[PDB]
Design a protein around this ligand. Structure first.
Ligand SMILES: NC(=O)C1=CN([C@@H]2O[C@H](COP(=O)(O)OP(=O)(O)OC[C@H]3O[C@@H](n4cnc5c(N)ncnc54)[C@H](OP(=O)(O)O)[C@@H]3O)[C@@H](O)[C@H]2O)C=CC1
Ligand SMILES: NC(=O)C1=CN([C@@H]2O[C@H](COP(=O)(O)OP(=O)(O)OC[C@H]3O[C@@H](n4cnc5c(N)ncnc54)[C@H](OP(=O)(O)O)[C@@H]3O)[C@@H](O)[C@H]2O)C=CC1
Ligand SMILES: [Zn+2]
Ligand SMILES: [Zn+2]
Ligand SMILES: [Zn+2]
Ligand SMILES: [Zn+2]
Lengths: 348, 347
């Protein structure tokens, strides 16, 4: 039997979100049915909702920062029981037979099923629906285990903001004394800041004004800039989470010899920056790479780490009916860090 | 007293080379006068000659692969004597006072003087003339010491093709068992192969056809492709020397996790490939950087290493009057590896 669901859907790129009844695939012998308690809003939600990257699949239900409780399990499930506290991230399935799947980087699988705005090739190519909803059905190998005493409203954005920034920090070996820049001081940015500080880094933040400078300082940030040109120092590592137009050269030039610039931010495609061969050679010996989310394994490692060291996103709790207001704030320079939807209260 | 010279000049971006008489600044107290014996031809000479990157300064005398013999020294010269065999690469002066200068990366000095197609601010902003000529006057700190018995025609291209490929291989710590790809099998491509092979790497070459497949095999190349999509394994390190349009993503996607793509090739600016943020993220965990020539100190080390291990470019000797044919061959797929001008025989 298909699982009945409800959530907050957008029907085309210029409309408002509305309550939407729908259904998901039946609980298969390896699936679990999760009741969703908290749903983080990521800026990827907005880019997808508005078709800023590509043409979206509508009706769309975004949200891929999911924290909840296991209500039901398929009969072959071994990794979870009813009552378990869990999280779901940016994808819910992959082919499990390719090189990326075998290397625990399922996010690069060519048959990866992202949580929303993506056809589910494992269920007759039906559109997958995200986390702005009351439940979700996920193959057990894509579910993150969460400590039952962790604050669940704070856990939810670890599922995307947390892994996406944790991953390149570890990949570039950020450690004690590493000079780290964080460009874009929002949901991902503040997680990058917290992890780099917990890792022993000396952290610089680049924002567009000083509205959150005190929160930066309170996080242990050593330099706060409102323009990359103000930074007079060479950095070893920079993570750019910027979701609007900018010039990659302004950051690449800040790096020391053999420094890394890790790109996670994803502006709309028509304004997204590029680097040419001439740019790399002019600013030579400074390395650039991209990072996409993380694998299931490293996502589990990151959640475990974050709960252990009490490293959580700064969140503001809202209801499903506030989604349009949250998206406005996030696109007009009015947001703080993460918004999180209290899904139980939204569905009274 | 200005030094008198002659060589082979282009007078605008769409013309043929012509014999040209000209003069150079006098031998200053830290300068040496060098008699040019062999002048390597670099594709950078063509891009500059043809204004493919920016507005050229004409008349222009390219060549930044110079081997020769010191004929005079200024009175304050302390590293060189008359008779020393030496090389000159892509630049002839710098501020000496910035941080790149001090860290032996003079090629990044904002006041660097490139060997040609560049105004020399140390000499009243006059255009500097390169190596397609009988002589050159260079500050001694920009001159490379060359073993007096090394084969000078094969030394000349070390001064640019050598350092440019040697530097990123060292920077990326290519070593025994590293899987290395080299894209564009021409002057820099062949040097890069020979270094990587000498360093014990497993080497793949990427060309546009198989005309030089047997030569790759001769040099110890393990795999030869005519399309990057042919390559079915992951590479630790790729150096791209390509001077025409291509899609960077075809190479980036061949790198293993934590692999390096090193960019040195510089196609005309109007068709220079780019990577967007979307490209990097879709192809995550694979690092890209550019490399520019090398500093003097690393250039000296590269030359010492090459000479000591007998690692030399494959060269074909030509006359100065054959410059246009050589440029033709290099822009029409008919070149082998490096052309070198036999300067003593060119006048
Ligand atoms: N796997 C991946 O690679 C992932 C990528 N992302 C992408 O990361 C980007 C950021 O996500 P999220 O953290 O949720 O975004 P949010 O808006 O929280 O944060 C973006 C931040 O960047 C600041 N900002 C915007 N433009 C600039 C600029 N030009 N310079 C400096 N700061 C700027 C914004 O502040 P203000 O507007 O108030 O000035 C805001 O604080 C999005 O494009 C999202 O799609 C997200 C998850 C995963
Ligand atoms: N410091 C720096 O960064 C420096 C950069 N350079 C740049 O390096 C580039 C190459 O220099 P050089 O080695 O002298 O050039 P040459 O022409 O010797 O060699 C280039 C090679 O690339 C091959 N080739 C051309 N297009 C492609 C393609 N799309 N895919 C694969 N192979 C291709 C050519 O073969 P064919 O055309 O016959 O198919 C040729 O064999 C130039 O842009 C030059 O300016 C040079 C010195 C220093
Ligand atoms: Zn996200
Ligand atoms: Zn797969
Ligand atoms: Zn300088
Ligand atoms: Zn050159």
């Amino acid at each position: 039997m298909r699982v009945q669901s409800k959530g907050f859907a957008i029907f085309s790129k210029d409309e408002h979100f509305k309550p939407h009844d729908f259904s998901r695939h039946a609980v298969g012998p390896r699936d679990v049915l999760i009741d969703i308690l908290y749903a983080g809003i990521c800026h990827s939600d907005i880019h997808s909702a508005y078709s800023e990257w590509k043409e979206g699949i509508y009706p769309m239900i975004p949200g891929h920062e999911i924290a909840g409780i296991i209500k039901e399990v398929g009969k072959g499930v071994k990794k979870f029981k009813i009552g378990d506290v869990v999280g779901v991230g940016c994808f819910v399935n992959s082919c499990k037979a390719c090189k990326p799947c075998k290397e625990h980087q399922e996010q690069f699988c060519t048959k990866v099923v992202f949580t929303y705005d993506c056809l589910d090739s494992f269920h007759d190519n039906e559109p997958h629906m995200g986390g702005y909803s009351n439940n979700i059905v996920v193959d057990e190998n894509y579910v993150i285990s969460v400590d039952k005493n962790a604050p669940l409203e704070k856990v939810a954005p670890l599922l995307c903001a947390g892994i996406t920034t944790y991953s390149p920090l570890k990949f570039s070996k950020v450690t004690k004394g590493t000079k780290v820049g964080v460009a874009g001081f929002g949901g991902l940015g503040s997680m990058a800041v917290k992890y780099a500080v917990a890792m022993g880094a000396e952290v610089s933040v680049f924002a567009r004004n000083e509205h959150k400078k005190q929160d930066a300082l309170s996080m242990g940030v050593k330099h706060f800039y409102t323009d990359p040109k103000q930074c007079k120092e060479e950095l070893d590592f920079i993570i750019s989470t910027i979701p609007t137009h900018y010039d990659l050269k302004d950051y690449l030039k800040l790096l020391t010899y053999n420094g890394d610039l890790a790109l996670v931010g994803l502006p709309p495609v028509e304004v997204a920056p590029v680097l040419s061969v001439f740019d790399f050679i002019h600013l030579g010996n400074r390395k650039v790479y991209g990072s996409l989310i993380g694998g299931i394994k490293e996502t589990q490692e990151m959640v475990d780490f974050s709960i252990k060291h009490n490293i959580y996103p700064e969140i503001d709790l809202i209801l499903g009916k506030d989604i349009d207001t949250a998206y406005h704030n996030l696109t007009h320079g009015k947001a703080k860090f993460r918004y999180v939807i209290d899904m139980k209260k939204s569905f009274d």
